[PDB]
Design a protein around this ligand. Sequence first.
Ligand SMILES: C[C@]12CCC(=O)C[C@@H]1CC[C@@H]1[C@@H]2CC[C@]2(C)C(=O)CC[C@@H]12
Ligand SMILES: C[C@]12CCC(=O)C[C@@H]1CC[C@@H]1[C@@H]2CC[C@]2(C)C(=O)CC[C@@H]12
Lengths: 125, 125
Amino acid sequence: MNTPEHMTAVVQRFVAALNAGDLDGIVALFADDATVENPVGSEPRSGTAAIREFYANSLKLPLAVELTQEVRAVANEAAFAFIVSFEYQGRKTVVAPIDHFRFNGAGKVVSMRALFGEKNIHAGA
Amino acid sequence: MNTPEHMTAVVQRFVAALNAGDLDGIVALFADDATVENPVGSEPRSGTAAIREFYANSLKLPLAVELTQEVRAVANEAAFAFIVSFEYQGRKTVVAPIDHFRFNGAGKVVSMRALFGEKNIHAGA
Ligand SMILES: C[C@]12CCC(=O)C[C@@H]1CC[C@@H]1[C@@H]2CC[C@]2(C)C(=O)CC[C@@H]12
Ligand SMILES: C[C@]12CCC(=O)C[C@@H]1CC[C@@H]1[C@@H]2CC[C@]2(C)C(=O)CC[C@@H]12
């Protein structure tokens, strides 16, 4: 039974896993046949193997992930605003996406879509 | 093609029209066969008539709407975080949803979903 409380807690665990670089933890929130579309408009990754690979590469560089507003959750779906910060070669970048999660009856994430464009990628600091 | 500037402009136009109670201004942004699902999980409403009725009913109370973060836009889709404030049943209320728009080739919104739950509805008694 997908309660808003459960979906919201999952978003929190997702953000926490990214910050800790806990790959297994992240993957554990997704269903076996879950799909990840990053960014929106690209071919979705499908399956545990593909999802694990995506997050492995996405975590090569240490990330500071933070929820910037309250989580929106209703009818087996949740959306959240946040930022992802990292640095390379003394250059700071802050990406500000809006993620959309769809959950199944078992409470696992069956679909994730990260919506953000170049204007949401802020270089400099 | 849907440029990030166009999708962002439409979102801004949407928020402005709501603030001004400009019913025609709002409906003009939608395709004649567009769908509105507000809130997410409810029965989708489609077609100009249904969409106009939804907004007319919504506008029966003065609405104070404002974007709270940068608009996210990429691949014919946009998502934004905002607040809708109004006084109802003797209580100042602030609703904080995250909306998602899908655009067609003519730059019209063909699908919109407003994701917000009871925990995103803040009534001040
Ligand atoms: C691709 C991007 C955003 C673009 C970029 O420069 C790299 C960064 C890596 C981490 C990604 C993020 C998009 C949102 C993702 C997909 C999450 O929600 C968790 C990992 C996040
Ligand atoms: C239904 C609700 C939220 C709940 C309520 O009591 C009234 C208010 C009316 C305006 C609606 C808003 C939900 C989000 C909507 C649908 C928008 O994105 C523009 C009009 C907005």
